[PDB]
């Protein structure tokens, strides 16, 4: 999965 803009 491409890392999202928030955790």
């Amino acid at each position, epitope marked *: *999965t*491409a*890392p*999202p*803009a*928030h*955790g």
Partner: antibody
Framework: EVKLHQSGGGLVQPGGFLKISCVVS????????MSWVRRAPGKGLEWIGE????????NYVPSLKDNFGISRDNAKNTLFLQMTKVRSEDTALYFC?????????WGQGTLVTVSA | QAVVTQESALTTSPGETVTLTCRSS?????????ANWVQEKPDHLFTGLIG???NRVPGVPARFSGSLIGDKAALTITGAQTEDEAIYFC?????????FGGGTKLTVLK
């Protein structure tokens, strides 16, 4: 090579309904979070919502929860934005965006005009 | 109804360093606000610069860096170029949604 191609939009009357599409190519769509964002005249960037690759999490700014619906079809590499019971203040340029660390990839934008 | 506050406008010039800040109405900006910075150039041309306070989007020049100075998130440009004249938007995460600030019009004096 990475392309977020938007289509739809245009003119809609107050109270009306409109669905925007964003077809992704150049990346494995099914592993990217996707987001919808808008830019209205005289107003800053506004984040509408986002959706996980598996569609099991769909997040919205609460004030737009009732007039926008986000979905995706990974088999057709397409992200959707349903505009529901549109208001005059929904006139804006709408952009799909894909997450990679931040707002990494961007569509060309879709103009939606709400006028009676 | 969280509000994200940025400087309305700042002026730098080519080769200089400038810092932009982003403040939360709910209190100190912390890691779980996952500050994102997005650049708007003319023609409604948007570019993501920083995600999760510190991380460069791939391809972003090294002259862009994020930070947490005090209670605020910050974007620093070291060695500004004419191409950096833009509106810079900061978005803060509030548990289940992003809120963008009003944006900083950055002038790189021509």
């Amino acid at each position: 090579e990475v392309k977020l191609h938007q289509s739809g939009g245009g003119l809609v009357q107050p109270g009306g309904f409109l669905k925007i599409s964003c077809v992704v190519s150049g990346i494995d769509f099914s592993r990217y979070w996707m987001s919808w964002v808008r830019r209205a005249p005289g107003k800053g960037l506004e984040w509408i919502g986002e959706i996980t690759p598996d569609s099991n999490t769909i997040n919205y700014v609460p004030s737009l929860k009732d007039n926008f619906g986000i979905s995706r079809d990974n088999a057709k590499n397409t992200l959707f934005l349903q505009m529901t019971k549109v208001r005059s203040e929904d006139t804006a340029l709408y952009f799909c965006a894909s997450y990679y660390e931040g707002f990494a990839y961007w569509g060309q934008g879709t103009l939606v005009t709400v006028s009676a | 109804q969280a509000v994200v506050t940025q400087e309305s406008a700042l002026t730098t010039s080519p080769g200089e360093t400038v810092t932009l800040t982003c403040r939360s109405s709910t209190g100190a900006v912390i890691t779980s606000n996952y500050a994102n910075w997005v650049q708007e150039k003319p023609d409604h041309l948007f570019t993501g610069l920083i995600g999760r306070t510190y991380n460069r989007v791939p391809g972003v020049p090294a002259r862009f860096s994020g930070s947490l100075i005090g209670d605020k998130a910050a974007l620093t440009i070291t060695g500004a170029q004419t191409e950096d004249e833009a509106i810079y938007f900061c978005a803060l995460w509030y548990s289940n949604h992003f809120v963008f600030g009003g944006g900083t019009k950055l002038t790189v004096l021509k």
